[PDB]
Structures are given as C-alpha cells and as structure tokens.
Amino acid sequence: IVNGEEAVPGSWPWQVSLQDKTGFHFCGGSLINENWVVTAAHCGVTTSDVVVAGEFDQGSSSEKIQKLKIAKVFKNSKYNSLTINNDITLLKLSTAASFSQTVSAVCLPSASDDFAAGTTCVTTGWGLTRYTNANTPDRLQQASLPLLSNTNCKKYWGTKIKDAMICAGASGVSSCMGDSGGPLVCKKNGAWTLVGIVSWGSSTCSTSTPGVYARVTALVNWVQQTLAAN
Amino acid sequence: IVNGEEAVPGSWPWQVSLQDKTGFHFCGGSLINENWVVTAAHCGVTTSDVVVAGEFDQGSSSEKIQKLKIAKVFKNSKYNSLTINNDITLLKLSTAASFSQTVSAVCLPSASDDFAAGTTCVTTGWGLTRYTNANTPDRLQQASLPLLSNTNCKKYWGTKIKDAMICAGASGVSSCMGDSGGPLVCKKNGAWTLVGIVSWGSSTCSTSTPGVYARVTALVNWVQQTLAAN
Amino acid sequence: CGVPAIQPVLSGL
Amino acid sequence: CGVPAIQPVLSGL
Ligand SMILES: [Cl-]
C-alpha cells in the first residue's frame, strides 16, 4: 500500500499473508471462516504455499502466528488472466485456524448489497509501499479510501472495467504489488464487510489512479456454492 | 506488441495462441515439439483452455488451424507471483500437433548458450498494440529488438531484475498485455532458438522501457527434466 | 464476523 | 527445429 499507515496490531484479524514454503510473502487473503480463505486468482496459490494468520510484523521473531497448510485451491473458472476479471480464488485449509482476539473472520456481503460510490472504505496488506522499493514492508499497513462508480472508474481505465470489478482510491493512496488478494472492507451495520479483493492497477501504483478490486457481490454466489459443495 | 508490424502468415510456425473455449486469446506460447508447449506461469492456464496452432488472423474463420486440448499443466514450483521470477509453465497436449508448413517447433538453447547484449532478436504475439486498446489485434504481430545485459536493464528496473530474467527492447517497440508466454527468439547456429518467454513490463507498455522475459537458459534444465519424466 | 476484538484506529474516517 | 518453411521478413533485421 502506497502512502498508507501502520495498522494497530491485531486490529484486522481476518488479514492473512500467503507465503511460499520459505516465508516469502507474495499475496494477502481474508479468513471468511475457520477453514476457508478468500484471495485473488492471479496470486497463483498452490498447495505448497502456506497461510499465515495472526501476524502483524513479518520481521518479528516472536508473535503468535498460525501457519496453516492449504488442502485445496479453488480458482474461479471464469477467471481470465488477460482481462483479469473474476479474480478470485478460495483456499480450503487442511487445518482449521483457531479464532482468538487477533484471528477471526470478515463478513461477506449478500449478492444484493449495495455500497455507494463515495463511501470511505479500508484496504490493508503488506504490499509495496513504493513501486520502486525492493522489499515488502515488515508491518501491516492500512489506508482508507473512497469507492468509485464503474462509470467514473471507466474515465481512467476505459472498457477494462468489467461488472465483476469495483474501483477505489485515486486519492493519495494506492494498493500495490503484494497487496493482491487482500481485503477492501467497508462498514455495514457495525461490521466490516468484504466488498473488494485487491486485484490490479497501474504498475507504478500511482496514487492519482484508482486501484481495481474484484467485486465481492458479483462473486458471492460462486463463493457460497463452492463452500456448500466442499 | 506496441509499434510492431504484421508478420508474414505462417512464418513463426511455433507461435501458438492460448484461448478459452469461446476463442478469447489471453496468452501466447511456443511449440517445442509435437506434444509440448512452453508458456508463462502468470498466464494461469488450466486444462479447460485450448492451444491453437497454425493461426495468423484470429478474426478469420477460414484458416486451417489446429485446436489442441491440454492434458496437463506443469507450472514451475519456483514461480513467484510477486517477483514474477521463474515465469514459465509447460503444457503437455493430449493430442499431438501435426507439423506442417505453418506448424513446427522452435529450438531450445542449451544451458551454457550465451546470447550477447545488443544482438537483435524477435518477439511475436497477439498482445495489445496500444495499452489503451480494448481488443488484441487480429493478425500476428512481430517486432525486432535488441537484448540488454542484466546490468543495463537494472538501470531501468533496479533489483526487480533477477538471474532468471533477461530484458530486451527499449528501442521504440514493446511487448504488451496478451503477448505473455510467447517467444523471444534469437538465431543460434542458423536456427531460431528460444531465448526468452514474454513475462512482464510497464503497464503502459512504454516503448522506451525494456520488456522483461523469462531467461530460458536459466530454466531449460527444469524444462528437460520435466519432459524426461513425463 | 467483521468486528475486531482490537479496534482499528484510522486517520480517514 | 527453428528453421520455418515460410521465411519471415522483418523490417528491423
Ligand atoms: Cl493458474
């Protein structure tokens, strides 16, 4: 996240880090229950990657984190790597996470929910804080930012904006490399709800250009259908 | 490819197109023999995707093409979606391509082959011809462009350039979205041989910035081991 | 779901 | 491998 700020430790308890088997972080994710994580299909997660829950500082020696194995990867079958549409993957964990004060789930919206353009939402992750930086930050970052209408978004991105996408930002902050898969949450009825999944944007992570997110309402039925069947 | 030119039809006979089942092109690839295609790991190919060989004009339905099914996908286990290192995948076809005038294989280099900086090589594909374009071009594009040394490429990209990458371009032309997975070919002992796999670059496909390719000499031993065991 | 035990503190509302 | 039966023609080479 470019121009964001450090989060309070444990304040985004559903935020997970996807790491390879050596501990290298490449994408974010969100816990939606004890056995399942939602992330971006373009992250390219496999069953050798690991989910890390409860982390704040990746450079910390001591933190009580849970390193969970992935039993199964469910990539949405309509994902397309050129248009980057339907950018969503579900991970079924081989071992259930243990919820606690620093590890718990985000809510999912209903397919009919509506989040108005202009609402101030939040996105978190360990993505680059500058596109020219060599490494991802050790500490979780956060930024608040506005949602945009698809019509306003199209002013910046043209026909690249599809119905399963939602844009936010262009206000001094930006999701960036390594943030993908992480949450874009907005408050609904007292609870943070998952409205977007960090998906794509400009390779400079420009803060005057809107980031693009997978629109969870357009994809929640597929999520529910996959959870029911597996 | 931005600022490329149309190829002579059938003159890049190993160039294949990776499409979903409605004919939507999302990445390139190269035939390395009758049963195998090499492409980029970030394309996210699955066994529901199809390989099309012998194509020139994707807006024509009168060309004699071969639509081949994928039996298995072998993604390199060191690929990483954040650094985009080791961006290569191999596809084993369930039906062998039939070699002909317009369909045949590119040569793989040996791991000790050297390709000097400044050599003029070629890249092909149906990637965007402008980053703001909505659609990929119908006819197969080609560009000539010089190889850069990793040291000079670091002037533009810093520490993002790794050992399994090689840069080419910054010469008024550029690979772009949808060119990924296709070939960067150079002549070695009289024959076109695969030196690079289109991998990543600037999201504006700027022609004064080099494209980054997966360095096939750093990966051919994984290729040959996968072919030998399968 | 979606209500942290440790409250987030943000600069932007 | 690597020859093509239909020769390529390039401006830039
Ligand atoms: Cl994939």
Q: Which residues of A touch B204 (CB under 8 A)?
A: 202-203
Token pair recorded at residue B217: 């000499």
Q: What is the H or E stretch that residue A220 is in?
A: helix A216-229
Cα→Cα distances A3→A13, A176, A208, D2, D8, Å:
22, 10, 12, 49, 49
Torsion of CA A116, A122, A126, A129, to 10 degrees: 90
Q: Is residue B118 packed enough to be buried (19+ CB in 10 Å), middle (13-18) or exposed (0-12)?
A: exposed
Q: Does chain A touch chain B (at least 3 C-beta pairs within 8 Å)?
A: yes
Q: Do the Cβ atoms of B44 and A41 come within 8 Å?
A: yes
How many whole angstroms separate alpha carbon A200 and alpha carbon A176? 8
Task: Give yes or no for a contact between B153 and B167, defined as CB atoms under 8 angstroms apart.
Answer: yes
Q: What is the H or E stretch that residue A144 is in?
A: strand A141-146
Long-range contacts of D8-13 (CB under 8 A, 24+ apart): D8/B7, D8/B8, D8/B11, D8/B12, D8/B122, D8/B142, D9/B8, D9/B11, D10/B5, D10/B122, D10/B142, D10/B144, D11/B5, D11/B144, D12/B120, D12/B143, D12/B144, D12/B145, D12/B173, D13/B120, D13/B122, D13/B144
Task: Give yes or no for a contact between B196 and B219, defined as CB atoms under 8 angstroms apart.
Answer: no
DSSP state of A209: S
Please list the active-site residues of B: 42, 87, 180
Q: Does chain C touch chain A (at least 3 C-beta pairs within 8 Å)?
A: yes
Q: Is the Cα torsion angle A104, A106, A107, A108 positive or negative in sign?
A: negative
How many whole angstroms separate alpha carbon A65 and alpha carbon A83? 35
Task: Give yes or no for a contact between B26 and B43, defined as CB atoms under 8 angstroms apart.
Answer: yes
Task: Give yes or no for a contact between B207 and B3, defined as CB atoms under 8 angstroms apart.
Answer: yes
Are A213 and A113 within one domain? yes
Task: Give yes or no for a contact between A1 and A170, defined as CB atoms under 8 angstroms apart.
Answer: no
Q: What is the H or E stretch that residue B66 is in?
A: strand B66-75
Question: By CA distance, what is A87's nearest residue in B?
Answer: B44
Q: Do the Cβ atoms of A48 and B77 come within 8 Å?
A: yes
Are B83 and B126 within one domain? no
How many whole angstroms separate alpha carbon A169 and alpha carbon A211? 6
Residue A183 phi/psi, 5-degree rounding, is -90, 150
How many whole angstroms separate alpha carbon A117 and alpha carbon A137? 30
CA-based nearest residue to B52, from B60, A222, A123, B44: B60
Are A157 and A191 within one domain? yes
Are B152 and B133 within one domain? yes
Are B73 and B178 within one domain? no
Token pair recorded at residue A12: 């985004």
Are B87 and B144 within one domain? no
Task: Give yes or no for a contact between B78 and B214, defined as CB atoms under 8 angstroms apart.
Answer: no
How many whole angstroms separate alpha carbon A162 and alpha carbon A215? 10
Token pair recorded at residue A173: 């902050």
Q: Which residues pair with A74 in a beta bridge?
A: A90
How many whole angstroms separate alpha carbon B28 and alpha carbon B35? 16
Q: Among this protein's residues, is A114 annotated catalytic?
A: no
CA of A138, closest CA in chain B: separation in Å?
A: 15
Place of tokens 């003159």: B11
Q: Which CATH number does the domain housing residue B34 bear?
A: 2.40.10.10
Method for structure elucidation: X-ray
Task: Give yes or no for a contact between A93 and A53, defined as CB atoms under 8 angstroms apart.
Answer: no
Tally of domains within chain B = 2
In this complex, the residue of C2, C8, C9 whose CB is nearest that of residue A107 is C2
The β-bridge relationship of strands B141-146 and B120-125 is antiparallel
Are B44 and B153 within one domain? no
Question: By CA distance, what is C8's nearest residue in A?
Answer: A11
Q: Which residues of B touch D2 (CB under 8 A)?
A: 14, 105-107, 185, 191-193
Are A139 and A86 within one domain? no
Are B186 and B90 within one domain? no
How many whole angstroms separate alpha carbon A204 and alpha carbon A113? 32
Query: How far, in Å, is the centroid of ligand 1 from the Cα of A86?
Result: 13
In this complex, the residue of B159, B177, B203 whose CB is nearest that of residue A202 is B203
Residue B76 phi/psi, 5-degree rounding, is -65, 135
Give the residue numbers spanning the domain of A90: 13-105+218-228
The β-bridge relationship of strands A25-31 and B141-146 is unpaired
How many whole angstroms separate alpha carbon B40 and alpha carbon B16? 13
Are B131 and B210 within one domain? yes
Rounded to the nearest angstrom, the gap between the alpha carbon of residue A23 and the centroid of all alpha carbons in its chain is 19
Q: Which residues contact A110 (CB under 8 A, 6 or more apart)?
A: A217, A220
Neighbours of A52 (CB within 10 A): 19
Are A146 and A176 within one domain? yes
Chains that touch C (3 or more CB pairs under 8 A): A
Neighbours of A203 (CB within 10 A): 15
Ordered DSSP codes for A21-54: TTS-EEEEEEESSSSEEEE-GGG---TTSEEEES
Of these residues, A42, A49, A174, A179, which one is catalytic?
A42
B contact set with D (CB within 8 A): 5, 7-14, 101-102, 104-107, 120, 122, 142-145, 173, 185, 190-193
Resolution (A): 2.1
Of these residues, A30, A174, A180, A199, which one is catalytic?
A180
CA-based nearest residue to C9, from B28, A57, B49, A6: A6
Torsion of CA B104, B110, B113, B119, to 10 degrees: 20
Q: Do the Cβ atoms of A158 and B134 come within 8 Å?
A: yes
Are A207 and A197 within one domain? yes
